[PDB]
Design an enzyme around this catalytic site. Structure first.
Site, PDB file in Angstrom:
ATOM      1  N   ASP B  93      -5.086  16.331  26.534  1.00 15.24           N
ATOM      2  CA  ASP B  93      -4.541  17.668  26.351  1.00 15.24           C
ATOM      3  C   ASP B  93      -4.291  18.325  27.714  1.00 15.24           C
ATOM      4  O   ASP B  93      -4.665  17.802  28.772  1.00 15.24           O
ATOM      5  CB  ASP B  93      -5.422  18.495  25.412  1.00 15.24           C
ATOM      6  N   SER B  94      -3.626  19.479  27.694  1.00 14.74           N
ATOM      7  CA  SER B  94      -3.183  20.078  28.945  1.00 14.74           C
ATOM      8  C   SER B  94      -4.205  21.029  29.544  1.00 14.74           C
ATOM      9  O   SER B  94      -4.099  21.363  30.730  1.00 14.74           O
ATOM     10  CB  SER B  94      -1.876  20.847  28.735  1.00 14.74           C
ATOM     11  N   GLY B  95      -5.189  21.464  28.759  1.00 14.13           N
ATOM     12  CA  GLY B  95      -6.104  22.498  29.167  1.00 14.13           C
ATOM     13  C   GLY B  95      -5.696  23.896  28.756  1.00 14.13           C
ATOM     14  O   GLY B  95      -6.534  24.801  28.794  1.00 14.13           O
ATOM     15  N   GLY B  96      -4.438  24.101  28.345  1.00 18.31           N
ATOM     16  CA  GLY B  96      -3.953  25.453  28.105  1.00 18.31           C
ATOM     17  C   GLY B  96      -4.613  26.138  26.923  1.00 18.31           C
ATOM     18  O   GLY B  96      -4.669  27.371  26.863  1.00 18.31           O
ATOM     19  N   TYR B  97      -5.116  25.362  25.967  1.00 23.34           N
ATOM     20  CA  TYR B  97      -5.797  25.906  24.800  1.00 23.34           C
ATOM     21  C   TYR B  97      -7.278  26.116  25.078  1.00 23.34           C
ATOM     22  O   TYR B  97      -7.808  27.206  24.842  1.00 23.34           O
ATOM     23  CB  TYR B  97      -5.594  24.960  23.612  1.00 23.34           C
ATOM     24  N   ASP B 144       0.769  24.590  28.098  1.00 22.32           N
ATOM     25  CA  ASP B 144       1.329  25.593  27.204  1.00 22.32           C
ATOM     26  C   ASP B 144       0.341  26.739  27.015  1.00 22.32           C
ATOM     27  O   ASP B 144      -0.749  26.762  27.593  1.00 22.32           O
ATOM     28  CB  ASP B 144       1.699  24.987  25.840  1.00 22.32           C
ATOM     29  N   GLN B 191       6.089  26.247  20.321  1.00 22.52           N
ATOM     30  CA  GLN B 191       5.361  27.468  19.989  1.00 22.52           C
ATOM     31  C   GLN B 191       6.261  28.358  19.123  1.00 22.52           C
ATOM     32  O   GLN B 191       7.276  27.906  18.590  1.00 22.52           O
ATOM     33  CB  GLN B 191       4.816  28.138  21.257  1.00 22.52           C
ATOM     34  N   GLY B 218       0.266  25.881  18.186  1.00 23.96           N
ATOM     35  CA  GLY B 218       0.086  27.219  17.651  1.00 23.96           C
ATOM     36  C   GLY B 218      -0.371  27.313  16.211  1.00 23.96           C
ATOM     37  O   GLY B 218      -0.386  28.422  15.659  1.00 23.96           O
ATOM     38  N   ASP B 268      -5.180  14.866  15.895  1.00 21.49           N
ATOM     39  CA  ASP B 268      -6.522  14.772  16.462  1.00 21.49           C
ATOM     40  C   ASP B 268      -7.339  15.934  15.921  1.00 21.49           C
ATOM     41  O   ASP B 268      -6.791  16.989  15.601  1.00 21.49           O
ATOM     42  CB  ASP B 268      -6.514  14.925  17.986  1.00 21.49           C
ATOM     43  N   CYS B 306     -15.895   2.636   0.974  1.00 15.50           N
ATOM     44  CA  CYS B 306     -15.701   2.535   2.415  1.00 15.50           C
ATOM     45  C   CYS B 306     -16.112   1.165   2.935  1.00 15.50           C
ATOM     46  O   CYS B 306     -17.169   0.637   2.586  1.00 15.50           O
ATOM     47  CB  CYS B 306     -16.546   3.611   3.101  1.00 15.50           C
ATOM     48  N   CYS B 308     -16.786   0.477   6.118  1.00 11.37           N
ATOM     49  CA  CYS B 308     -17.351   0.549   7.458  1.00 11.37           C
ATOM     50  C   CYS B 308     -18.728  -0.118   7.521  1.00 11.37           C
ATOM     51  O   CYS B 308     -19.380  -0.367   6.506  1.00 11.37           O
ATOM     52  CB  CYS B 308     -17.404   1.999   7.955  1.00 11.37           C
ATOM     53  N   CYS B 311     -21.641   1.797   5.785  1.00 11.15           N
ATOM     54  CA  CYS B 311     -21.708   1.681   4.334  1.00 11.15           C
ATOM     55  C   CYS B 311     -22.062   0.276   3.878  1.00 11.15           C
ATOM     56  O   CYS B 311     -22.492   0.103   2.737  1.00 11.15           O
ATOM     57  CB  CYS B 311     -20.402   2.187   3.716  1.00 11.15           C
ATOM     58  N   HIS B 337     -19.235   6.326  10.400  1.00 10.34           N
ATOM     59  CA  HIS B 337     -18.669   6.379   9.059  1.00 10.34           C
ATOM     60  C   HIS B 337     -17.490   7.348   8.987  1.00 10.34           C
ATOM     61  O   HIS B 337     -16.446   7.020   8.421  1.00 10.34           O
ATOM     62  CB  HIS B 337     -19.710   6.781   8.013  1.00 10.34           C
TER      63      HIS B 337
HETATM   64  C1  LIG Z   1      -4.334  18.348  22.121  1.00 12.21           C
HETATM   65  C2  LIG Z   1      -3.114  18.442  22.409  1.00 12.21           C
HETATM   66  C3  LIG Z   1      -2.503  19.118  23.562  1.00 12.21           C
HETATM   67  O1  LIG Z   1      -2.506  20.551  23.338  1.00 12.21           O
HETATM   68  C4  LIG Z   1      -2.296  21.310  24.429  1.00 12.21           C
HETATM   69  O2  LIG Z   1      -2.155  20.874  25.549  1.00 12.21           O
HETATM   70  N1  LIG Z   1      -2.294  22.639  24.088  1.00 12.21           N
HETATM   71  C5  LIG Z   1      -2.528  23.086  22.809  1.00 12.21           C
HETATM   72  N2  LIG Z   1      -3.629  22.696  22.209  1.00 12.21           N
HETATM   73  C6  LIG Z   1      -3.876  23.190  20.923  1.00 12.21           C
HETATM   74  C7  LIG Z   1      -5.068  22.816  20.279  1.00 12.21           C
HETATM   75  C8  LIG Z   1      -5.351  23.313  19.001  1.00 12.21           C
HETATM   76  N3  LIG Z   1      -6.483  23.157  18.196  1.00 12.21           N
HETATM   77  C9  LIG Z   1      -6.221  23.883  17.123  1.00 12.21           C
HETATM   78  N4  LIG Z   1      -7.064  24.033  16.101  1.00 12.21           N
HETATM   79  C10 LIG Z   1      -8.374  23.410  16.043  1.00 12.21           C
HETATM   80  N5  LIG Z   1      -5.013  24.491  17.158  1.00 12.21           N
HETATM   81  C11 LIG Z   1      -4.434  24.152  18.369  1.00 12.21           C
HETATM   82  C12 LIG Z   1      -3.256  24.518  18.995  1.00 12.21           C
HETATM   83  C13 LIG Z   1      -2.975  24.056  20.278  1.00 12.21           C
HETATM   84  C14 LIG Z   1      -1.760  24.468  20.992  1.00 12.21           C
HETATM   85  O3  LIG Z   1      -0.933  25.254  20.543  1.00 12.21           O
HETATM   86  N6  LIG Z   1      -1.624  23.933  22.247  1.00 12.21           N
HETATM   87 ZN   LIG Z   2     -18.557   4.174   5.590  1.00 10.10          ZN
END
Ligand SMILES: C=CCOC(=O)Nc1nc2cc3[nH]c(NC)nc3cc2c(=O)[nH]1
Ligand SMILES: [Zn+2]
Ligand SMILES: C=CCOC(=O)Nc1nc2cc3[nH]c(NC)nc3cc2c(=O)[nH]1
Ligand SMILES: [Zn+2]
Lengths: 371, 371
Positions: B93-97, B144, B191, B218, B268, B306, B308, B311, B337
């Protein structure tokens, strides 16, 4: 099919012995180290990982299991082996030590120990043997009293005498239960503090009752290594030569080596697991604390010679990060390495005795470990 | 040798697609679920166990890694793959969140975000791309801003417009770094909150810049499933059809199924790992809380179908005991699991799309899961 219990000595060097215990659920190579599986788990390891490190047998804590999840419950679910997924031998302690060290309140009498959980509960020779039966233990320990250290001769004698009466009660309880007597083994525990005459009286009493193996109890309770070794010097020769000798609660790698030099065949200790979770890793050059900043960029494995899966894949730097971060994987990797290190120590001990070079191994081990 | 990046669609049903992303470090089967590897570990699992559950790719948290152990340090040690022992693709991820959700204090501007660690630190499009390069990420996310929910149209527009300017800066930073541009992929993030016109402007801006894949940002920020699905209904068709569509931070099993029905290819979420450590196990009959007393003597596995390893071996009763006792093995078994359950869900989704029966699968899944 394997017998209920057979101990055979394959090689000897001085007081040290190497050999095997055959039991229905597997063979135990001696001298042996038993990882501790407190409350039905060797902490942070799957049973398959415990086995992969070389362990032949694990220890279960009767005091903890009778409180959670309960001995009757484990029996209803098919026994401890099925419950936790370990199909090889399990030795269970009697509860007599942990009840006194871990309970909030205790009441001691000739009948046993009444205690409050850390709920009111009871332990006696008869109930201890029954709990170990409900768990499905392969090696059952007699219910004893670990005399506090230091102890006056009078108090050590009175305590040892009670333990010997409890040893006979443990024997009779075990023998009354046909399925247990036919499929498990029973070990007696020598007491007597640091006093040679009391140790001899205790050994004589235990041999008169008769057990499948004999433990040296009452040590590793604050006396220090010099005193522990002095007591082992005279205490182990008092036990029957043809049965296993078990030193419970020991210990550091050098404690184990010196105890084998004095005739001990079996050991258990929380040190590799508990101290692993805290960040202490054992190496042939002595222990290290992986939390130390000097490991933050160290790409070497925990130990340069260790054959374990942790040392094959991950660096000190990574494990340093995990432990500093409080990550579960840090506890997992440290524990697997430490248990594997202990098993490699036991393997080197067994091989060196088999080859008549254990005295040299002990000298070389200590020179490098303490350098 | 595999290309830097190739996405191929093998089968379609309505808006749903199944196919593969080929990258230098491996193939990713889509729709895909990425276990979350926060601070260089998927919590409580060795990487080999993560792979054994079926995961093709994992996610790394840039915000956490830049703080501990540090991005420059990880680069000095050989990159994130070597450091943690995962040799397959990693999306960062970018860190922006996380900077906005986890930092003690923040200062936002057109340049980026200045923040205090939970030490003063800085994140901008350029620094984010640089950190992801130092980590050695395979899929790099543009830096972002996740607009809070609810948002007024004015504030959603201003936020989205800044994110699009940051998307162009992210593109240019990525392209300036030859080794990164040649070996990694870059995804842009749409966004616009819940507003169709802003979502369209954002999609248009991202397509004009050009990315290897497109995320719907978003969402999963408090709007609820009905509203999330309504926004996906119009938002996913705005993105290029021939590139992967990524919904980050989602979600529960039924969230995933409905998002695939709306054209999402990648997901994810911390739910399987974090809620596993808390005692929640996913089953085809809905989630269960293994701590509940009703499981104390239940010999069945966590889920009846399952496949796994958990289980196959251990009972609900045992895992109930471990979680109640706070044992590390409880977290390990629950997490393995749950991640395996999520991968089996993704496999059933992929197979049903490939066979033209995904609509029926989604209906049958929901009827049983919510029964
Ligand atoms: C991980 C991927 C890369 O994401 C970014 O670099 N930025 C970003 N992360 C988010 C993470 C979120 N988690 C949730 N709910 C648990 N909503 C999210 C929304 C965003 C978003 O708008 N931007
Ligand atoms: Zn299992
Ligand atoms: C585990 C084997 C079965 O033991 C018993 O049923 N009772 C017993 N446990 C002990 C445990 C000890 N730990 C240490 N030091 C860490 N010293 C110990 C001494 C004893 C003892 O004298 N008796
Ligand atoms: Zn090792």
């Amino acid at each position: 099919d394997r017998p209920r219990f057979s101990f055979s000595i394959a090689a000897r060097e001085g007081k040290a012995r190497t050999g095997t215990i055959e039991m229905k659920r597997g063979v135990i190579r001696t001298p042996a180290f038993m990882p501790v599986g407190t409350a039905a788990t060797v902490k942070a390891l799957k049973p398959e990982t415990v086995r992969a490190t070389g362990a032949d047998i694990i220890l279960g804590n009767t005091y903890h299991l009778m409180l959670r999840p309960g001995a009757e419950r484990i029996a209803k679910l098919g026994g401890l082996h099925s419950f936790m997924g370990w199909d090889r031998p399990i030795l269970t302690d009697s509860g007599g030590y942990q009840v006194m060290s871990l309970s909030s309140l205790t009441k001691q009498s000739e009948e046993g120990v009444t205690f409050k959980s850390h709920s009111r509960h009871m332990l006696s020779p008869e109930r201890s043997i029954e709990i170990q039966h409900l768990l499905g233990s392969d090696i059952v320990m007699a219910f004893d009293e670990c005399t506090p250290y230091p102890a006056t001769p009078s108090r050590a004698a009175s305590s040892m005498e009670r333990s010997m009466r409890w040893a006979k009660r443990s024997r009779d309880a075990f023998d009354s239960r046909k399925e247990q007597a036919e499929n498990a083994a029973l070990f007696g525990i020598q007491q007597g503090s640091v006093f040679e005459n009391l140790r001899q009286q205790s050994a004589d009493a235990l041999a008169e009752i008769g057990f499948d193996g004999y433990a040296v109890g009452g040590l590793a309770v604050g006396e220090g290594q010099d005193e522990m070794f002095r007591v082992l010097d005279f205490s182990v020769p008092m036990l029957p030569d043809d049965k296993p000798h078990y030193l419970m609660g020991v210990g550091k790698p050098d404690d184990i080596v010196g105890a084998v030099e004095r005739g001990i065949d079996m050991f258990d200790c929380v040190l590799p697991t508990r101290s692993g979770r805290n960040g202490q890793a054992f190496t042939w050059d002595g222990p290290i604390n992986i939390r130390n900043a000097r490991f933050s960029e160290d790409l070497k494995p925990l130990d340069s010679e260790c054959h374990c899966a942790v040392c094959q894949k991950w660096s000190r730097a990574y494990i340093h990060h995990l432990i500093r971060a409080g990550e579960i994987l840090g506890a997992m990797l440290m524990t697997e390495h430490n248990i594997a290190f202990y098993q490699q120590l036991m393997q080197k001990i067994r091989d060196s005795i088999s080859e008549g070079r254990f005295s040299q191994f002990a000298q070389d081990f200590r020179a490098r470990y303490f350098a």
